[PDB]
């Protein structure tokens, strides 16, 4: 069935036979930095 339409006319919609999963939520320390390059006290002293 090279054209995309031929399958759709004959294929069955078996969606109400399978039960949906009971839970489907799929979308942590914000204060802790992950950059890995701390600010030196000389950089603060020279900058500010």
């Amino acid at each position: 069935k090279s054209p995309t339409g031929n399958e759709a006319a004959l294929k069955n919609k078996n969606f109400n036979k399978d039960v949906a999963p009971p839970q489907s939520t799929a979308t942590p320390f914000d204060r802790h930095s992950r950059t890995g390059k701390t600010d030196s006290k000389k950089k603060l002293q020279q900058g500010w």
Binding site: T35, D39, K43, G47, W48
Partner: protein, 84 residues
């Protein structure tokens, strides 16, 4: 059209001119403490009742921080904030 150029009466009293006047001084690498107070006493020289300059961003550091340099009297809320 006819365009004429006039010099401002009070440079310190005008918050416009001193803003770009600060901009030129900032670009020359001067330390912020020397630059920030260099205009504040000029506004206080002009007799302006108050002046506050805020510099925020980065200077030789990754983390962004703010420094506010207030002086003199301040009004903050209400209709006069648009007039004065």
């Amino acid at each position: 059209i006819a365009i004429y150029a006039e010099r401002v009466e009070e440079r310190g009293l005008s918050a416009a001119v001193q803003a770009e006047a600060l901009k030129a001084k900032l670009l020359s690498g001067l330390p912020i403490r020397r630059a920030a107070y260099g205009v504040l006493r000029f506004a206080m020289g002009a007799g302006a009742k108050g002046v506050e300059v805020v510099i925020s961003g980065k200077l030789r550091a990754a983390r962004a921080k703010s420094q506010k340099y207030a002086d003199g009297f301040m009004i903050h809320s209400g209709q006069p904030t648009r007039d004065f």
